[PDB]
Design a protein around this ligand. Structure first.
Ligand SMILES: [Zn+2]
Ligand SMILES: [Zn+2]
Ligand SMILES: [Zn+2]
Lengths: 62, 113, 428, 34, 290, 239, 198
DNA sequence: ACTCTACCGATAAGCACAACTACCTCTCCT
RNA sequence: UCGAGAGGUA
DNA sequence: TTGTGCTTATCGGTAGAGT
């Protein structure tokens, strides 16, 4: 649950993520796709929910 | 501003003065009744300056001015130049004496002139 | 009925321009004390006792004395006989549009229709003047338009009602004109025109211009809006909105900012951005709008312990708190706490309408009861009978069962301030 | 593209010594709705 | 503008005395600040006392003003001083109170024969009695209560009616710099706000007339009105232009942006081509073209 | 924070700093003419009464505008030190600190609101309610709180809201704190003052359009070759 | 009446300073006169008569200006007529009038009607309390002569109309007694500017 | 000494515009 | 298409 | 809803002019 006024603490989220076998801070080691080298800093990745707005490029073309 | 009702018809009394009587009297216009006045006081009001009702909060009337601040003086306990100066009388001294209050939040030092 | 406190400008010289109390009833501009003595009062002391200021202020006493003097000067010997009644009748007849009824009948029905007795409305006027004087002295706060305690909302019961009324009036005018044209020189169906109201409603719905609440002309806009079909959320939030009408948009006041009265009724975090910022408010999830109750709660109130209002103005109210129902002084209560507790207990047992606000304020020493429509309500758990829930026999309780058993109740905005509310179960 | 409304009928009597007045639009899923 | 803010700077000779600037500013504020008689008085009542026809007919309604000595000590005032101030204010205008009033006498008494209340024992009483020229037109109480009492309260015991409020402020970049000596640590100037009740007389000229006893204390070489419109009429178009440039620089600095000096100078020289700072409306442009 | 203990230490430090800032504001509020007898170096027996009335200071601050401004200035001055704790409790590799020091985006105060505490929340316009100094569930139920119309200390008509939020965005906000934040930030979404810059720009352009520099070196107006400036008053460097 | 005496002393000192700035050959003793010396020389009661003096231009003795102090305030047209007759008898083309209060409309019409024959200036006592010229905001003002004005017009090849304007009612213009059609030279703390009296 | 007009300074009382730029859809009629 | 009223973009 | 002019109306108001 992600109820606004009943949100879980950050510690609980970190513990749940740690129990999943990943870093507790939400960042994972990534490797550059162009060269294959390992990046020095971990990159935060997560499945957020996104929305597509009704505004389009071709609708604004004049 | 003193309103009283006569014992006969319970109507408001109007103060009046008679030269021959040389005394304060009250007589209402409803019945021909006159009573002896007491305390010889026809008006008594505590002086107040609250003439702007429900308006002193929205508009800053500046009823209590802020004390001035100077940067010429230098505090003793701390090397801070800002202080609050004002004039006040001592516990038993006669006259006005200049006082100083340090503006440093961590100092809290006050001294005389 | 309007009572205005202002400096006298009629038959007043330069020296005497102090504030006096005036009554604006049917555009007559009558002195307050003449009206007091007309409503079954024969003593200045009794009238002073009716206006129970219970304070020592020089300005209030000066205003009262000035009002007495103005009443005495305007009408000679008004206390004796019925000269005040004749004066007020003459003032009413002096209006450009005087009522057809006589003075003996206008005062009964055009002045405080709720109070049948002629002496009770005098006491109500005294209470009104007392409230005005307390507000002037600063002891009582003035009503604010931003607060929802003093506001009501109408969606379809009243917005369409005035359009129906005005179109029916226009149809009646057309029908009587046609009948007068035809009589001097036909089925009843031909006399009445059916297209009038239909076309009027169609034009009102299409153009979006709705009839002004207080003005015959200058139709208001923004009442009717189009639905959004982009996603179900848009059409869900469009149906649940509240509009605040303001003459101008740039200069409005404090109506654009959230208020503590918005707690739980309308969302304070989501408002449209732009010209109508804060004027349009989205209703909360637990948001209900009260409706008019067919049943009358006057009879049930006397059973709880409320006593009738004293008809005689001579009898004073020592400690009896005032009971007001929809702005009408229905009666009195000896002790407000027990009366309110018993009324709430009766409401929780489904013996009273489920949409009713019971307000008890010790500052004004009165009990305020509302049962009209337009009030915003939300359900709140009641911890007094919360232990009754733990039966363990049933599951999936319907909301009607919970309301009947008193586990949950509908609380108005005015009533919520009186009670103490817990945010979470863990805190409880 | 027509109005979803309902007719109103009231009886009128004229004395000398059910007619149609208008159609009111109907809200969806009201008390009177199919 | 009704407020008509002013700006007064202290003279340099006060620097010789220890803490001279603070004492000078406090004295100027004390002398120039308006103090209403209503604030000083606490209880005002009208007592009925027989006239006894001593030498001149007078109303049998004396005004008793009770003032605590603590307030007088705080405000550095005496009963004789406030009585003299009230008499001076009454004789200064005497345009109000359009009644049969000839002369007004004010008497100071420490202890009064009033048995109505004795809550305060260290409060003096001021007696004000009106005198009528052998007439009974003043015998009524309503006229006295409605006219005389408000007039006495509105009369200032200290300062002048024109000056509304005076506050002492510290600044580091004054609009009017010193001649040559530059302490640069800052100066303690006084900002004076006046009343725009009537535009009959100039506020600056009225302020000059009030500061006659303390002309030496105020450094008139740097003092100037805060307004831009009348600063041209007081000290010339160039002084108004300089003050306008300073205010524009201050506004730009407050905005947080950096603007070159030439732009502001050109704006100032363009808005005062005709020698008068016209408004930004179409009326000002039309007047400038005319 | 490096670990949970560092987070607890930071939370306690922020709480103590906020308490100290509140006390500093209360001390600064006394700089008025009504307390000149108390501020002087004498013998006063009302020293305890000045510190016993803690809730009255908030009510006095909300009613008075000068007191509100003084309290805001004192709170900012005291809260600079509280904001300074981020460098002590922040790692060098922190992205927020890097972006704040580089100046690309954000500042120290935004990071403080992100992690430590939102801080002072005040509104310029006058309102009918006031924040009851605590922003808790118990405060919202107090009949004598400024939020419930007036405190009865005779009634009040307008207020200058003044509230301090101890919680941060990361830790979450209780509904009262969210209400306070929404009241404070509602002024930004308004459409006011959006036409004033445009109108001022148009009028200033109408006034300054005709000005141009002449071949002779003078600054002349287009209408009648009116002399605005004999020479350009720029401090160089190219003519 | 000591306040009136010191007020008159300040007014006289400011008037002498203005005359010296205008070049009327003011003696150094008058400029450096102290308050004690002023009250000793004036006497017990001046009656607003000792201040009335006559001064002549330093360069040319023919030009002369007379300062007039009326005995009473709210002056009328009779005193204006008497002053004009006195000026005609004494053959003086300029005068300075210092009045406690503002002039009557008839007096203003009379003083404006005879402006062509003789030039008269009116100064309020409140204005002369503080010397406007000796101010930090006010820059240096230098009045250009006819030859200087002609050279200025010829150098920039600009008409007198196409110049920044200064109204006659400006305090500096009245302080320097400048008539319409005269340009000024202003030095700012350098770049100089010129203003045309209109 | 003792009286009529007449241009002139300060408060009411109505007009009279104007409250941003570039954009894009949708319904209503016109 | 010529207009009006709404809803949105930067 | 106002900010800013803007233009009469209107209240004395006293200055000359006269007797
Ligand atoms: Zn009686
Ligand atoms: Zn210190
Ligand atoms: Zn007394």
């Amino acid at each position: 649950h992600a109820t606004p006024f009943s949100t879980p603490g950050v510690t609980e989220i970190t513990e749940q993520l740690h129990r999943a076998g990943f870093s507790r801070w939400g960042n994972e080691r990534v490797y550059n796709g162009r060269s294959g080298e390992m990046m020095r800093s971990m990159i935060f990745m997560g499945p957020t929910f996104y929305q597509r707005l009704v505004h389009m490029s071709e609708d604004k073309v004049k | 501003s003193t309103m009283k009702f006569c014992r006969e018809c319970n109507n408001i009394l109007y103060p009046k003065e008679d030269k021959e009587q040389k005394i304060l009297l009250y007589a209402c216009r409803n019945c021909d009744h006159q009573e002896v006045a007491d305390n010889s006081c026809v008006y008594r009001n505590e002086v107040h300056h609250s003439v702007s009702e429900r308006t002193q909060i929205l508009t800053d009337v500046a009823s209590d001015p802020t004390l001035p601040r100077t940067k010429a003086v230098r505090c003793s306990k701390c090397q801070h130049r800002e202080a609050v100066f004002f004039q006040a009388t001592a516990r038993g001294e006669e006259g006005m004496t200049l006082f100083f209050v340090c503006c440093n939040p961590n100092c809290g030092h006050r001294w005389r002139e | 009925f309007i009572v205005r406190l202002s400096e006298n400008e009629k038959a007043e010289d330069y020296k005497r321009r102090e504030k006096v109390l005036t009554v604006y009833f049917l555009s007559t501009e009558i002195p307050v004390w003449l009206l007091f003595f007309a409503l079954g009062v024969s003593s200045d002391k009794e009238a002073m006792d009716l206006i129970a200021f219970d304070g020592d202020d020089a300005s209030i006493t000066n205003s009262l004395i000035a009002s007495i003097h103005v009443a005495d000067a305007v009408c000679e010997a008004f206390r004796c006989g019925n000269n005040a009644l004749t004066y007020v009748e003459q003032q009413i007849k002096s209006t450009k549009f005087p009522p057809a009824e006589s003075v003996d009948e206008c005062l009964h029905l055009y002045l405080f229709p709720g109070l049948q007795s002629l002496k009770k409305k005098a006491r109500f006027l005294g209470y009104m003047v007392k409230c005005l004087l307390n507000s002037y002295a600063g002891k009582r706060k003035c009503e604010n338009r931003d607060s929802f305690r003093n506001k009501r909302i109408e969606l379809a019961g009243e917005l369409l009602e005035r359009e129906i009324r005005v179109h029916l009036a226009h149809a009646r005018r057309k029908m009587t004109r046609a009948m007068q044209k035809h009589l001097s020189g036909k089925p009843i169906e031909h006399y009445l025109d059916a297209s009038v109201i239909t076309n009027g409603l169609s034009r009102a719905f299409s153009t979006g211009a709705w009839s002004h609440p207080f003005r015959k002309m200058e139709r208001v806009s923004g009442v009717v809006a189009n639905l959004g079909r982009a996603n179900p959320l848009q059409t869900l939030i469009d149906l649940r909105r509240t509009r605040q009408q303001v003459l101008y948009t740039g200069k409005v006041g404090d109506a654009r900012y959230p208020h503590p009265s918005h707690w739980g009724r309308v969302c304070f975090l989501s408002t449209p951005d732009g010209e109508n910022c804060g004027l349009v408010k989205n209703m909360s999830l637990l948001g209900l709008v009260s409706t008019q109750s067919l049943e009358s709660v006057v009879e049930k109130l006397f059973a709880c312990g409320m006593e009738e209002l004293m008809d005689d103005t001579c009898t004073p109210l020592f400690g009896k708190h005032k009971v007001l129902l929809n702005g009408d002084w229905v009666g009195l209560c000896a002790d407000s706490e027990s009366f309110v507790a018993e009324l709430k207990s009766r409401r929780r047992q489904s013996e009273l309408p489920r949409e009713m606000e019971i307000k008890r304020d010790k500052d004004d020493n009165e009990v305020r009861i509302f049962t009209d429509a337009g009030r915003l309500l939300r359900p709140l758990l009641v911890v007094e009978n919360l232990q009754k829930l733990k039966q363990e026999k049933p599951s999936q309780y319907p909301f009607d069962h919970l309301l009947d058993h008193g586990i949950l109740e509908l609380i108005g905005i005015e009533e919520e301030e009186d009670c103490n509310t817990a945010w979470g179960i863990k805190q409880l | 593209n027509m109005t979803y409304s309902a007719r109103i009928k009231v009886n009128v009597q004229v004395e000398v010594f059910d007619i149609l007045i208008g159609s009111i639009p109907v809200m969806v899923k009201s008390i009177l709705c199919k | 503008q009704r407020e008509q803010t002013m700006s007064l700077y202290l003279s340099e000779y006060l620097s010789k005395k220890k803490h001279g600037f603070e004492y000078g500013s406090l004295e100027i504020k004390n002398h120039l600040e308006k103090l209403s008689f209503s604030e000083i008085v606490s209880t005002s009542m009208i007592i009925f006392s027989p006239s006894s026809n001593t030498k001149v007919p007078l109303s049998p309604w004396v005004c008793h003003f009770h003032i605590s000595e603590k307030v007088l000590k705080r405000k550095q005032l005496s009963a004789e001083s406030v009585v003299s101030s009230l008499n001076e204010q009454y004789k200064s205008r005497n345009r109000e109170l359009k009644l049969d009033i000839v002369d007004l006498d004010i008497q100071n008494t420490n202890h009064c024969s009033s048995d109505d209340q004795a809550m305060k024992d260290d409060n003096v009483c001021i007696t004000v009695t009106v005198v009528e020229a052998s007439k009974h037109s003043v015998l009524e109480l309503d006229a006295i209560r409605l006219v005389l009492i408000p007039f006495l309260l509105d009369s200032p015991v200290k300062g002048d009616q024109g000056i509304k409020k005076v506050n002492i402020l510290w600044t580091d970049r004054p609009k009017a710099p010193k001649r040559n000596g530059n302490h640069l640590a800052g100066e303690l100037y006084l900002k004076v706000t006046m009343y725009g009740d009537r535009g009959k007389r100039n506020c600056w000229t009225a302020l000059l007339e009030t500061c006659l006893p303390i002309m030496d204390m105020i450094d008139w070489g740097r003092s100037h009105p805060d307004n831009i419109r009348q600063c041209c009429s007081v000290y010339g178009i160039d002084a108004g232009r300089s003050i306008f440039v300073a205010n524009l620089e201050s506004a730009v600095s407050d905005t947080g942006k950096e603007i070159l000096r030439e732009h502001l100078l050109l704006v100032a020289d363009s808005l005062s081509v005709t020698g008068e700072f016209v408004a930004l409306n179409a009326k000002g442009w039309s007047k400038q073209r005319q | 924070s490096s670990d949970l203990q560092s987070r607890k230490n930071l939370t306690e430090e922020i709480s103590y700093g906020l308490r100290e800032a509140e006390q500093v504001c209360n001390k600064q509020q006394l700089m008025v003419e009504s307390w000149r007898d108390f501020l002087a170096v004498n013998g006063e027996d009302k020293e305890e009464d000045s510190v016993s009335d803690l809730a009255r200071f908030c009510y006095e601050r909300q009613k008075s505008a000068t007191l509100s401004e003084l309290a805001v200035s004192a709170f900012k001055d005291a809260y600079r030190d509280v904001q300074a704790l981020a460098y002590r409790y922040g790692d060098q590799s922190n992205s927020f600190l890097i972006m704040s020091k580089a100046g690309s985006k954000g500042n120290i105060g935004k990071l403080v609101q992100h992690s430590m505490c939102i801080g002072l929340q005040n509104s310029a316009v006058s309102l009918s309610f006031g924040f009851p100094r605590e922003l808790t569930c118990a405060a919202w139920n107090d009949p004598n709180s400024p939020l419930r119309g007036a405190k009865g200390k005779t009634t009040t008509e307008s207020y200058v809201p003044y509230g301090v939020i101890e919680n941060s965005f990361l830790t979450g906000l209780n509904p009262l704190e969210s209400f306070v934040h929404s009241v404070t930030s509602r002024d930004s979404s308004f459409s006011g003052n959006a036409d004033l810059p445009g109108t001022l720009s148009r009028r200033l352009m109408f006034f300054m359009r005709d000005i141009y520099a002449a071949y002779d070196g003078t600054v002349r107006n287009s209408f009648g070759n009116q002399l605005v400036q004999f020479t350009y008053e720029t401090d160089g460097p190219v003519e | 009446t000591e306040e009136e005496l010191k007020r008159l002393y300040r007014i006289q000192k400011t008037l002498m300073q203005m005359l010296r700035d205008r070049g009327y050959f003011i003696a150094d003793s008058e400029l450096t006169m102290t308050k004690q010396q002023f009250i000793r020389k004036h006497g017990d009661n001046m009656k607003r008569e000792d201040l009335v003096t006559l001064k002549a231009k330093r360069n040319d003795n023919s030009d002369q200006l007379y300062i007039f102090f009326p005995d009473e305030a709210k002056v009328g047209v009779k005193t204006m007529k008497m002053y004009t007759n006195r000026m005609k008898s004494e053959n003086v083309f300029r005068a300075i009038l210092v009045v406690q209060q503002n002039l009557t409309p008839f007096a203003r019409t009379c003083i404006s009607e005879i402006s062509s024959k003789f030039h008269l200036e009116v100064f309020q006592e409140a204005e002369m309390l503080v010397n406007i010229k000796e101010h930090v905001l006010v820059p240096e003002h230098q009045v250009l002569t006819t030859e200087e004005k002609k050279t200025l017009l010829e150098r920039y090849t600009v008409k007198e109309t196409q110049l920044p304007r200064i109204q006659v009612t400006d305090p500096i213009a009245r302080y320097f007694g400048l008539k319409r059609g005269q340009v000024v030279k202003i030095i700012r703390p350098r770049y100089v500017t010129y203003r045309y009296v209109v």
